[PDB]
């Protein structure tokens, strides 16, 4: 694990190049001049629940855009068919890997947010919350099926495995 | 300027060319949510939020700026406290707790009036830790002091 971490650091140090000069970039300053967006101040856990329910609503809209009735997405982001499929229904269920990749990213985000929701209800201790957040970022590959969707993501897991050992 | 939280709470609670284009930037909102996760010594954290008129998307709109020696010192304090806690005390949390068929929990009815528990803090003896005693566990420490930080 020492040799692999030092290998990735040598690769990041060797492939370093200065970024290209450009005009300075501000997305939300362009969003603010649009009258369709407003601003407020909220708590972190409230917006963390709003983000995951909005992601559920977005994936549900992307399912029900193509008039699909035989698929079901759980609130914890698991997609399952309701019946045994046919030839044409599998042709009408051809989404990209980006769909399931964003699905697993929202699944990871919902795990991370609900770990705090379980804490602020008084159920677990902060000493146990710090363990729980440490298990998630170490075991993304075991808690999610996101490794099947991007293969280069195998680099990201083993590094989190290697930092798992040393510490 | 800003807007009170009850409006956007009602927006998210009760709820198409204008609606469809706003969902393009959803993993950007995921990134802005994940880079601002609160530290183990904080209990709550208030962040600004941009939101659509119909509740399409919600961003966090803040970069997590810390002072580096304060940050390393706070994590070393957490390191010592967690070593002390494991040599003293263990139930790992049961993963995903909320089941597949139930919706995510409403904030306004279940967390909004419930006071949180105690965080992870070191003791900080008032004789030796006197230069750091008044600001060591704030969100952005010394933000409103003109002598140490340049401004807001």
């Amino acid at each position: 694990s020492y040799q692999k971490l030092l290998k990735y650091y040598v690769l990041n140090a060797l492939k370093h190049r200065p970024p290209k000069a450009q005009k300075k970039r501000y997305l939300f300053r362009s969003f603010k001049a649009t009258k369709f967006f407003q601003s407020t101040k909220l708590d972190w856990v409230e917006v963390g629940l709003q983000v995951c329910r909005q992601g559920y609503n977005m994936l549900n809209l992307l399912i029900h855009r193509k008039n699909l009735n035989y698929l079901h997405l759980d609130y914890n982001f698991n997609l399952k068919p309701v019946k045994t499929l046919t030839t044409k229904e599998r042709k009408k269920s051809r989404f990209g890997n980006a769909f399931h990749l964003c699905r697993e990213v929202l699944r990871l985000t919902k795990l991370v947010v609900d770990s705090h929701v379980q804490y602020r209800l008084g159920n677990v201790d902060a000493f146990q919350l710090a363990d729980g957040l440490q298990y998630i970022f170490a075991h993304v590959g075991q808690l999610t099926g996101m490794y099947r969707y991007k293969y280069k993501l195998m680099r990201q897991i083993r590094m989190c495995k290697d930092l798992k050992h040393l510490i | 300027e800003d807007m009170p939280p009850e409006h956007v709470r009602k927006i998210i609670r009760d709820h198409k060319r204008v609606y469809l284009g706003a969902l393009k930037y959803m993993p950007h909102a995921v990134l802005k949510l994940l880079e601002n996760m609160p530290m183990p010594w904080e209990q709550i954290r208030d962040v600004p939020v941009l939101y659509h008129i119909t509740g399409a998307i919600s961003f966090v709109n803040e970069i997590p700026w810390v002072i580096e020696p304060v940050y390393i010192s706070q994590w070393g304090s957490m390191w010592i406290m967690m070593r002390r806690e494991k040599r003293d005390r263990f139930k790992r949390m049961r993963f995903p707790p909320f089941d597949d068929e139930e919706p995510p929990l409403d904030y306004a009815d279940n967390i909004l009036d419930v006071e949180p528990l105690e965080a992870i803090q070191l003791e900080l003896d008032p004789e030796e830790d006197a230069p750091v005693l008044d600001w060591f566990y704030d969100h952005q420490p010394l933000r409103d002091s003109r002598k140490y930080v340049n401004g807001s």
Partner: peptide
């Protein structure tokens, strides 16, 4: 019609960051 023009103007503003260099 106006809302798509607003999103197209914001996309053209995003493309303005590299507009004279890319084309």
């Amino acid at each position: 019609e106006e809302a798509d023009a607003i999103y197209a103007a914001l996309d053209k503003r995003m493309d303005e960051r590299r507009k004279e260099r890319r084309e």
